[model samples]
Target chain A: PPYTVVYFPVRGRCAALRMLLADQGQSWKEEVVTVETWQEGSLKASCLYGQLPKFQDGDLTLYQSNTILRHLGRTLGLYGKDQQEAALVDMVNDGVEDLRCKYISLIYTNYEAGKDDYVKALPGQLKPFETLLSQNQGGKTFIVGDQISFADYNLLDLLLIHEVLAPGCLDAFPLLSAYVGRLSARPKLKAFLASPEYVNLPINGNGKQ
Target chain B: PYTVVYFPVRGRCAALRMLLADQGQSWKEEVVTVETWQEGSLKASCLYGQLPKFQDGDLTLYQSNTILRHLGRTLGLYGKDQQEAALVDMVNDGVEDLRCKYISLIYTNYEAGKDDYVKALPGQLKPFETLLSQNQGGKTFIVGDQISFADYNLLDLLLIHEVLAPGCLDAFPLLSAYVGRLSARPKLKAFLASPEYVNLPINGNGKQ
Candidate 1:
């Protein structure tokens, strides 16, 4: 009851955290902000960064999407078991965020002109995650350690959106492909993925995705 | 000692460098010249085609913020607790967001966009000042009473912005005082004035 997510109806930045909450079986409230409402300007001005995906956990309202993820990870015991593993989790998440930022820029700003180059560079951008998975028990488990960190949810969402953006992009990276399949098969997450709230929303604000 | 691999310019590595110095942690720098990076092999081997790779014992990591978080965790600079750590990350994320804009302005469109960017600068900086006001009435650090890795990164951002637009912080009294208080730490002050930081350009390009 304490968790509240205020974001656009689109999955966009909130997808991974929603996935995290679903996979973890944590119930939360969604305060969906429509484009029409956003254009009214008052709510946008109140936003810390003038962006969406404003999240609240009790009295502590947060703005950054990744900040929300890390907060949930901390409170939900999904960060890592130890400091070293936590660092590794952060590293993986940071890499995912870097790619996610590029993906967001392409989707919202330059989808038509940049999609081809983005798809071409997709392999290189994705190879690091593949290598990370490969190093961690040959892709059997999560990206950082034995357990699923918050980064896995973010990465899973990134990969899923990319598959939509560039079909067959994951085919070359066998580890990433299998990792996605494995993580998506989680029972609760699978159900959430099939639900209308997840299915009805577009992957991005722009029609590109 | 830890090792930092990057170009000679302060650039993205400056915050972590300041963190290390202020914390009295020693580190070695493996300088990568542009000519060396142009050779392609090293560039190809990097995790995400970027520099500022860091090594702590057997584990080598990329991404500058990741390195800072690692150092923060290991050195007890993250926060006093999990909630504070989240706030630290939140502050660092804001810093990173603005740093990216600053970087784009410097490397991509300085000649064309300086005036517009500077005009929007106050709004860009207001959130940080408001953050300070909400936390301890602007007396303490960015997140909590204690210093975190985000503080160093935010400090570096404010420092470079002062170089970008002189007296940029004059309007934001909290940020100006925060920057002054943080920069005056004995070790950090020494490091800021030393050739290691002072001699190098704020960015790889000629622009500040």
Candidate 2:
């Protein structure tokens, strides 16, 4: 219960960490910033990079979602067994970050204008993750190793949000589809996903998605 | 031989290149010119159609940040411990966020967007200076007292920005001094000064 997450009332970037904590059976608290308060600009000003989803562990505060995930991954033993596997973990996570970046740009900046092109090109963007899955136990194992790493949660959030953005998008990648189902069906995470705690929140701060 | 395949531009590979040099490791560059990229075979073969594909002996890696992290892992430049590793990731990610802004500005909307970006730049630059402030007298590495991969990436980010917006670091004394300090590293200095680095364009589009 040492961690506190500060973000807008959306799942945006915090969804993975939330799911990770829930699945790992760890306790934590959230400090949600209302739309009105975010609009007031003080919180944005105080934020190191003028972004949401700031995290704190005890007294040490951190910005950047991946930073928080990696920190928690280290503390929670969700990274990987060794250096090579850790690098692979980072590779998977970075791939997720790249697609998420494009997804964020399309959502926030050019949703109506770019949605068609984005969805049309979505499979190519997703193939790498599918390839990643295929390489590891034919998608039976976690992203990098046998154990679930933070990258799995990050990838889960990414694949879930993409489905929201483009319905049934994961159907083409059987591995990803089963991967999502397998991960989502985990006891604590299953409950967390169904509960109002997660189900009630919008996927993004601006509310379009 | 370690070979990095990329366009003649230093766009994504600069940080990795700098890392190889700073680590005193020898490597070769497989240049992909604009003409060849248009021919389409090489680009098509690229799994992600992205450049800076790195070959480390038998293993091949894509994604610039992944390559940097892999190199960091191999070269023993990540960090001393798990906490230091997290701090290192934090620093590298921060540098990456700013670099994304820098790239979007330079490549997509340079003429129109550069001014506003420069005007609001101080807020963005201060965090690293603050990172330095928390360290040993702003005189040591970006994380802990030892060098890490983030230092190389951050150094490249700071250098390119100074080229884009001269005198920008003047306000942040620590960053300003940080640049002076890092560029003086013998391997880095020689690499920065070499024809291998200077002959090719910093960017593919000739924007800067």
Candidate 3:
């Protein structure tokens, strides 16, 4: 039996793990817990630690999305080969999260105003990624190295979400836009996104996309 | 010569590193950029990626306060020996950061109204340190197995700052009282209020 991954059906927190598993060609059962079922089960008891994307690998269970990301990255060998690279990857991942926070704030706090701001600021925000991708690649295909790494998957996933939420999100940054397109065209990734098991939650009308 | 860890002198970002040095430890100097400095060099740089608390070991240099704490706990012999105790310590340290966020928001955004809110919520907030201090012993300590990372100067520094800041911890039932008691003993912690060298520009008004 594959490892048991429990979370709400939405890709809200489970997307990275799902992508990691898909990228590794590993088999795992994705268990979606309904609100009613969760309330009746261990959800209420575990709510103090806050929301899901909880993982049960063998007997050990863990919480926290970033912690889970680190664990999965370690388990799947997507983390940097060296300690410094691991630290750098962690820093970059956290930087992405910080940007995500701003995006979240914009969406929830000033929906209409945020759309204008996002459109205006997307270029500046994307510039760093373009530079990073170009410099890191040095004309190679991936972000970290010759082989596909978690950072590449992360970039792909983030850009994919951005595109879904904001259609022309990557227009100004031609490099990143092209990079996202190329990554999205990957046979395994494309197959995973299309599969029923990998269906993400519907973007609510609250200005997603 | 000692390792010169760089940050705005007043900000608590360098507190741990400072404490590590104060314990007669060694480090090479670490510096922060001017554009990112906070509260007139009292705080560290503002960049999302870089900040105070980077370390220069015998060989490698690295950042991240949590990572530093982990290293200190391991190398400085200041953390719990057991795995479970270490986990609890880590969780508590994370909680301290969360509480610091709450402290910053209350201090910066609602300073004028903080006295009132703190007065109302003192019942909940004040007990925090008291509980921590009393958890293992009335040593006013936070950790269980001696002076661990949580106990060795970080929480105490935060607690002391909040006590000095107007209206902070006033609402808390036991925290201010505890702070008074803790701060009185200069013999225990020498650098309670003393300032250190940092690289950020200083703000006269002390607001970041």
TM-score of each: 0.98, 0.95, 0.67
Chain B TM-score (model 2 vs. true structure): 0.97
Q: For candidate 3, what is the DockQ? A: 0.16
CA lDDT for candidate 2:
0.88
All models, DockQ values? 0.77, 0.61, 0.16
Q: What is the C-alpha RMSD of each candidate to the true structure, in Å?
A: 1.2, 1.8, 6.5
Candidate ranking (TM-score, best to worst): 1, 2, 3
- Tens digit of per-residue lDDT, candidate 3, span B92-153: 43444444554454456656755564554433343345445545544444445444444434
> What CA RMSD would candidate 1 show?
1.2
Q: Per-residue lDDT tens digits of candidate 1, residues A68-165?
A: 99999989999999988888888889999999999988988888999999999999999999989988998899998899999999999999999998
Residue B78, model 1: Cα distance from true site in angstroms = 1.9
Candidate 1 per-residue lDDT, tens place, B64-138, comes to 999998998898888898778888988899999999999999999999999999999999999999999999988
Candidate 2 lDDT tens digits, A1-209: 65799988888889999999999988887888887889899998887777877888877778889999999888899989987777778888988998999999998999889999999999998888888888889999788889999999999999999999899999999999999999989888999999998999999767777
Candidate 2's displacement at residue B30, Å, is: 1.7
Ranking by DockQ: 1, 2, 3
Q: List the candidate 2 regions with Cα displacement exceeding 4 Å.
A: A39-43, B39-41
lDDT of 2 by residue, B1-208 (tens): 7899988877878888998998999998888887888998876666566776778888777788888888887788888887788788889999999998888988899999989999989988998998899898799899997888899999989888888889999999999999999889999999999998888777878886
Complex DockQ, candidate 1: 0.77
